[PDB]
Design a binder for this molecule. Sequence first.
Ligand SMILES: CC(=O)SCCNC(=O)CCNC(=O)[C@H](O)C(C)(C)COP(=O)(O)OP(=O)(O)OC[C@H]1O[C@@H](n2cnc3c(N)ncnc32)[C@H](O)[C@@H]1OP(=O)(O)O
Ligand SMILES: CC(=O)SCCNC(=O)CCNC(=O)[C@H](O)C(C)(C)COP(=O)(O)OP(=O)(O)OC[C@H]1O[C@@H](n2cnc3c(N)ncnc32)[C@H](O)[C@@H]1OP(=O)(O)O
Ligand SMILES: [Mg+2]
Ligand SMILES: [Mg+2]
Lengths: 436, 431
Amino acid sequence: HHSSGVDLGTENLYFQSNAMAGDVELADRARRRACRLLRRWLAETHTPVEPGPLSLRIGPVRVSAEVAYRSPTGAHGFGPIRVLDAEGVPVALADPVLLAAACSADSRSRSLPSAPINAPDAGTAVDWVLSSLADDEDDEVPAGMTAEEAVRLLSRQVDDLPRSPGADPWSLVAGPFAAIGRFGRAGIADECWLLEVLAGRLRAVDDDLSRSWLSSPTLADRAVLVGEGLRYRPDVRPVPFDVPNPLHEGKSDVPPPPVPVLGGPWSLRPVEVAVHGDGGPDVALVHRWMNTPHVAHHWNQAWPLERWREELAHQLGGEHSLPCVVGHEGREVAYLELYRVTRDKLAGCYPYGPHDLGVHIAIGEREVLGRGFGSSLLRAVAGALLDADPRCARVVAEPNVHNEASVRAFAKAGFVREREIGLPAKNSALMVFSRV
Amino acid sequence: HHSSGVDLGTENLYFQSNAMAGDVELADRARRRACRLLRRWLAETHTPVEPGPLSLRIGPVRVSAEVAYRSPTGAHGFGPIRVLDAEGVPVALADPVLLAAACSADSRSRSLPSAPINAPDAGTAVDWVLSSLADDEDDEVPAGMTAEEAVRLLSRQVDDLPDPWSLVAGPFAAIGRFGRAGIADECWLLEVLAGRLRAVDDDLSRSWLSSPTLADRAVLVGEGLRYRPDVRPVPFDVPNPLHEGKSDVPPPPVPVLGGPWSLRPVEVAVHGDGGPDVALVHRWMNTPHVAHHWNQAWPLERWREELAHQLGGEHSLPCVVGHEGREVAYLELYRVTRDKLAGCYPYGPHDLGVHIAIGEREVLGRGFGSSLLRAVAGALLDADPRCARVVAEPNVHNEASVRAFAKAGFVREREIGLPAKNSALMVFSRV
Ligand SMILES: CC(=O)SCCNC(=O)CCNC(=O)[C@H](O)C(C)(C)COP(=O)(O)OP(=O)(O)OC[C@H]1O[C@@H](n2cnc3c(N)ncnc32)[C@H](O)[C@@H]1OP(=O)(O)O
Ligand SMILES: CC(=O)SCCNC(=O)CCNC(=O)[C@H](O)C(C)(C)COP(=O)(O)OP(=O)(O)OC[C@H]1O[C@@H](n2cnc3c(N)ncnc32)[C@H](O)[C@@H]1OP(=O)(O)O
Ligand SMILES: [Mg+2]
Ligand SMILES: [Mg+2]
């Protein structure tokens, strides 16, 4: 009767409808995976998240979703994750493997070509995700759970952290904190309150690990999408990285960046923003420098003049960043930002000491310079900062691993490349100039 | 007022609803994409399709979908495409990028490490799919279209043709979309198309009406595929729906080998354990070098049932080859017009193929194989004077067998995509 299809009876419709029943749950399962990946991408890239629209370039795709619930531990709750074309039209929903592809494309690109993540036998997060679709579905948190019972689970879990000398430091983030986020995202309890409770369970035992977890400004977590050392042989061989420690004070009495005094051919002074008019010649110099191509290619801050005026005034009015004009034998040639790490984005990336100072650098008169200037200046600045503040342990910097002139200039000046770090727009070599 | 969320007013909900309105359309577009990809995969691997359930291995995932509409041109209509775990439970919906990833893995593996598809710089179908998400999507066939307008548009399109894959990619594509839309029966539209080809007597039209295969362009399967962001497709042969062969082709003949060689059909005894021949093949088929390639290291009863099945039909003829009195190999001699190979190259009706396993290479693996292949081919060409070719389809990865065939006078003509493997189409031609 039918040649291009099957002849239909009610029994056939019954069979197919009991199959299409479960598709709804299959839909939710993909949503949860994609939500997990995005949480990781944001965590491993130290991308700031706040409620409302989140908009994000990840590899080759514009990505956008509503942050319905912002989580203190990073367990954000998302609206539909959508893919956008160049002008904001949604073109797709971000399925788990679509994200795994965008992130793998983005990550492999963030790291250097010679990195392990880019070895031919290395595999990709796509392989990892594809391989795990049949894996066991973790129980989501029962919506009716009581905060009382939530604390009971957390206290029990906290007390089961390895009383062991060689024990995993990511245990705290991967065990208890993960639970806290699932509790908050489920609407079961406020995560700050749960964290406060966990601090209490940690204070009760003065174990070495317990006390450091209360005192360190960062904690160990494990990355699965961002990091030069990643492999996905079949599954992921994750790599450790530092995330902010929520159990640790949010401001301190650390004074602003000092104004160092440099040796040799170098002069240094803070920028001055005139309150009258368009800002003055210092604002003009930075604006001009920051819009030249060789600078803008790395800083990506080729803004209009008034935007730079407010930035410099903004920095100068605070305790974070100190913008400076550097001169070489009387000619003004470079711009610096010297900043307190404890108030910078870098503070969530490595175990900083309270007085750490960092530097951003741009040589603006590159129309003539690239002749040993940067490394000599960088060296002077580091020793000069260590002289200005004897409670500072390190001067640090975050050049893009691809910014090969900056990285080499930093190391010629005596910085040591400790590790790669994932930042929102780039992966950076954490260069460290250490005291004595 | 809320610390971890946004304070909601009705205006915020309005903004979010015109977004979720379009989400439904975002779902269908993924569905249309995934169905387009699966159509290509099935075509380019020559995987057989009939209505009802289709179940299929693609790279690292079991894949399963209902075939609601079986298309003469391959534009099949699917239910939900689902991914299944090892014991049949669905675990995911086969989203478009998921498919391109599984197919990329499967294809890169099917082709040789030296193939362009496997170069470090080649890019992957994943790159191609992601890069095209932002494309403006081609319009669907107007659901209210009349069959007349279907014919009018098709005739106009046929008449504006000159490349050989122009037919499958132009007219057949429309027939597939017309059919899948329910506008007209594809068999009727294909018949109309045939007439418009008779109307012009040029070599091009005549070949299209007479050849058992047509040229199509592949985008997932092929040693030569490149994805410089965009895909650089490669040609392959698909079955020709406009062709049905007069056929009347007899079963495979029994060749007579010269020199040190003897050949005879297998015998399967009734009621016992199949006799001694069923045992010898089963013994051979389970030794490591044989099972490593044939993947037919079965128990004894499946081979009894297997060989009996072949001998009773017009497809395959199982034979035992002896060399100077020692039985040393197993052959399957088969008619191409009845084999999986018939959708893969422009076959002649009497073409014959051969599968071979040398079981006593563990005692007689010393240069014999190519020489036996040479004898068998010429003896088959003697047995069927209407046969044009002897062919074989070893896995492109089985380079020892390929080399043995070419030493015996077969030519490695092309790579072809078969349901489980890519094969070197080795051809011994009477020319
Ligand atoms: C917010 C932010 O953007 S974070 C701030 C970090 N960003 C930056 O530092 C980018 C600033 N852009 C610039 O152009 C910077 O002024 C610089 C530091 C990168 C210029 O410094 P330079 O004048 O080039 O210093 P210098 O001449 O000493 O260069 C040192 C090394 O760079 C290497 N180098 C120079 N150019 C290149 C290049 N194109 N590729 C690779 N290495 C290079 C030089 O060979 C030298 O190494 P060497 O010891 O073997 O000779
Ligand atoms: C579904 C299916 O079953 S697909 C059917 C196709 N069959 C298969 O895929 C599996 C085949 N399995 C077998 O065991 C096959 O019989 C073989 C061909 C692989 C056995 O044959 P062989 O014993 O290797 O024959 P032979 O040694 O002559 O091989 C000839 C090739 O090897 C070389 N060779 C190797 N040893 C010798 C030798 N001792 N003397 C001369 N030539 C030799 C020949 O020069 C020739 O070409 P090459 O130099 O380019 O490699
Ligand atoms: Mg019916
Ligand atoms: Mg409200």
